[PDB]
Amino acid sequence: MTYNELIYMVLDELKLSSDDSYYTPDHVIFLLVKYRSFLLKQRYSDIKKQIPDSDYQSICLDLIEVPAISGEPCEGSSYLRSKNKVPTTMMIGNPRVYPMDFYQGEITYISRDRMRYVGYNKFLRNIIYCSKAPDGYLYFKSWNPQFLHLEKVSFNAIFEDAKEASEMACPEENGTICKLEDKEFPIEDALVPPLIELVVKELRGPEYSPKDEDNNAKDDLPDAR
Amino acid sequence: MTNKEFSDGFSTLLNSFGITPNITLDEYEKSTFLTNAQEQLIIDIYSGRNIIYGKSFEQTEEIRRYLSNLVETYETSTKVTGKLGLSKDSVFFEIPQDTWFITYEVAFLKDSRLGCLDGIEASVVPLPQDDLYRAKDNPFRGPSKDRVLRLDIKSDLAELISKYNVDKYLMRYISQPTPIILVDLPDGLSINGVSTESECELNPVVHRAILERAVQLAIISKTQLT
Q: DSSP for A77-115, please give it.
A: --EEEESS--PPBPTTS--EEESS-TTS--EEE--HHHH
A6 in reach of chain B (CB within 8 A): no
Asked if A181 is an interface residue toward chain B (Cβ–Cβ < 8 A), one would say yes
| A5 at B interface, C-beta within 8 A | yes
Method of structure determination: cryo-EM
- Which residues from A are below 8 Å from B139, CB to CB? 4-5, 8
DSSP state, A38?
H
The H or E element that residue A207 is part of is: helix A192-207
Gyration radius of chain A's alpha carbons: 22
Q: Nearest-CA distance from A181 to chain B in Å?
A: 9
* B24 to B5, B27, B91, B212, B224: CA distances (angstroms): 16, 10, 54, 15, 16
| H or E element that contains A63 | strand A57-66
Q: What is the bridge-based pairing of β-strands A138-141 and A79-82? A: antiparallel
CA A184 – CA A162 distance, rounded (Å)? 10
Which residues face A58 on adjacent strands?
A156
**Ramachandran assignment for B119, one of left (phi > 0), alpha (psi -120 to 50 degrees), beta (any other):** left
CB contact A25 to B (< 8 Å): yes
The number of residues making up chain A comes to: 225
Nearest to A12 among B132, B133, B141 (CB): B141
What amino acid is encoded at B192 in this protein? N
Give chain A positions within 8 Å (CB) of B140.
Answer: 5, 8-9, 12
- Amino acid in position B55: K
Q: Does A23 touch chain B (CB under 8 A)?
A: no
Name which of A5, A8, A17 is nearest B131 (Cβ-Cβ): A17
Give exposure, A69-104, as e/b (b: 16+ Cβ within 10 Å): eeeeeeeeeebbbbeeebbebbebbebbbbeeeeee
Put simply, the answer to whether A12 touches B131 (Cβ < 8 Å) is no
**How many CB atoms neighbour CB A139 within 10 A?**
20
Q: Which helix (H) or strand (E) holds B29?
A: helix B27-47
Taking an 8 Å cut-off on Cβ atoms, the answer to whether B134 and A4 are in contact is no
Hey, of A6, A12, A14, A17, which one would you mutate to test binding to chain B, going by the most B CBs within 10 A of its CB? A17
Q: Using CA of residue A30, residue A36, residue A39, residue A45, what is the dihedral sign?
A: negative
Contact A19 B133 (CB under 8 A): yes
A90 min Cα distance to partner chain B (Å): 31
Mutate to test the interface with A, among B138, B144, B147 (most CBs of A within 10 A): B138
Give Cα separations from A212 to A16, A176, A203, A208 (angstroms): 20, 43, 18, 13
Residues 6+ apart with CB under 8 A from B106: B121, B122, B123, B124, B169, B170, B171
Half-sphere exposure of A177 (CA within 13 A, CB side): 16
Task: Give the residue among B219, B94, B221 at the shortest CA–CA distance from B154.
Answer: B94
The widest CA-to-CA distance across chain B, in whole angstroms, is 79
Residues in B closer than 8 angstroms to A8, CB to CB, are 137-141
Nearest chain B residue (CA) to A181:
B137
